[PDB]
Design a protein around this ligand. Structure first.
Ligand SMILES: [Zn+2]
Length: 168
């Protein structure tokens, strides 16, 4: 399954306040827990929480509900993307990643992303999108026993680490 490392940060709105939490912390803000089909799923929120998403049909940041958070055993390698200006993120090898090409978001599996592909970051104050190139790609042996994901209602995009737009 597709996932992120637990130390990945995600932009959320908690009780009306925007902030970043790690995916591990996000998982802990839910209860409930059920273990089934080798994964742990939590659906009931402990705080009033929404996730910030990017709506590609309108080019706009939007808020949406979190349907569930998931913790799964780590199996595959991760891929780390280092971006122009020094930001970075990591996903499992087949995780969808959004790159910006010729005026649209292309959804590629992480292992198909190439150096020089463009990633979109958001300026949080103006909500303006900015383009940064992928500068380096690394394959990383899984470094923790569990990885984490979430399902965001409708848009299925999230804003991670240093304001990076990607697919949930
Ligand atoms: Zn849905």
């Amino acid at each position: 399954g597709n996932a992120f490392p637990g130390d990945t940060r995600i932009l959320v709105q908690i009780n009306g306040t925007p902030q970043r939490v790690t995916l591990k912390e996000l998982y802990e803000l839910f209860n409930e827990e059920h273990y089934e089909s080798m994964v742990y799923v939590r659906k009931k929120p402990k705080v009033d929480i929404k996730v910030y998403s990017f709506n590609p049909e309108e080019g706009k940041v939007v808020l949406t509900d979190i349907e569930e958070v998931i913790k799964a055993p780590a199996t595959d390698h991760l891929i780390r993307f280092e971006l122009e200006l020094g930001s970075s993120f990591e996903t499992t090898v087949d995780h969808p990643v959004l790159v910006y090409e010729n005026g649209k978001f292309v959804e590629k599996r992480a292992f198909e992303v190439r150096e020089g592909n463009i990633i979109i970051i958001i300026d949080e104050s103006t909500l303006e999108p900015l383009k940064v190139a992928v500068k380096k790609i690394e394959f990383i042996e899984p470094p923790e026993d569990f990885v984490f994901s979430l399902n965001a209602k409708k848009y299925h995009t999230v804003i991670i680490n240093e304001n990076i737009v990607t697919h949930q």
